[PDB]
Design a protein around this nucleic acid. Structure first.
Ligand SMILES: Nc1nc2c(ncn2[C@H]2C[C@H](O)[C@@H](COP(=O)(O)OP(=O)(O)OP(=O)(O)O)O2)c(=O)[nH]1
Ligand SMILES: [Mn+2]
Ligand SMILES: [Mn+2]
Length: 174
DNA sequence: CGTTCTATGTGTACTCAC
DNA sequence: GTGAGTACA
DNA sequence: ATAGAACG
């Protein structure tokens, strides 16, 4: 059980204090690559976890980022962890809260921000409407017949447009 | 023929068996 | 190592 | 979004 007001605050603590351990060397993830997503990006009044998105700049780093995740000074358990999804139950001023971390390559930034803000039913109703047209939309790309179709694309709003859906700010998405 | 309702996707990390 | 089958998005 | 079905 978690409300937006400190959900905002928890993410503020972390914007500066996420890092991983790359073959002995700690490396800090900088906020120009931390994105809030999920119900927090959609400004839901009440949350039941925080979903952060971590953008790694080169592929060779994916294997090491999340399995070796380190947040400065706060205890947490990993329930699950791989190289593109990890889940952490963290201690917030004597409160236990669920933290889901994901990772996207730069090449995936909009596709991944889209997919990971949601809401769920939004996603089910766009991945459907695009399959009809012999496409498939997932976390990583827009694919027609197992080949990525190139889109001169950078942010979310251009992707939502260039595939043919009305763009609504996170809060008003469904 | 219009109004209303309904349904619809996809991938990751995990776990036991052969 | 593969991989069906599951928890959980 | 969109299309198929029940409804009138
Ligand atoms: N819940 C859910 N999320 C999914 C699913 N598939 C993809 N997603 C994406 C969209 C969600 O924004 C994101 C996971 O978000 P969460 O499951 O934590 O819920 P959300 O953040 O949207 O609201 P919440 O965390 O429940 O307060 O993953 C799915 O099948 N179920
Ligand atoms: Mn969430
Ligand atoms: Mn989550």
């Amino acid at each position: 059980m978690l409300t937006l007001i400190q959900g905002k605050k928890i993410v503020n603590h972390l914007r500066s204090r996420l890092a991983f351990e790359y073959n002995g060397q700690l490396i800090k993830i900088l906020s120009k690559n931390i994105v809030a997503v999920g119900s927090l990006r959609r400004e839901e009044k009440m949350l039941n976890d925080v979903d952060l998105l971590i953008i790694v700049p080169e592929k060779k780093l994916l294997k090491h980022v999340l399995p070796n995740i380190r947040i400065k000074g706060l205890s947490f358990s990993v329930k699950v962890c791989g190289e593109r999804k990890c889940v952490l139950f963290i201690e917030w001023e004597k409160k236990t809260y669920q933290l889901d971390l994901f990772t996207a390559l730069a090449e995936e930034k909009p596709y991944a921000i889209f997919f990971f803000t949601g809401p769920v039913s939004y996603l089910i109703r766009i991945a459907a409407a695009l399959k009809k047209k012999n496409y498939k939309l997932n976390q990583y790309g827009l694919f027609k017949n197992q080949t990525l179709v190139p889109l001169k694309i950078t942010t979310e709003k251009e992707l939502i447009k260039e595939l043919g859906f009305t763009y609504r700010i996170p809060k008003k998405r469904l």
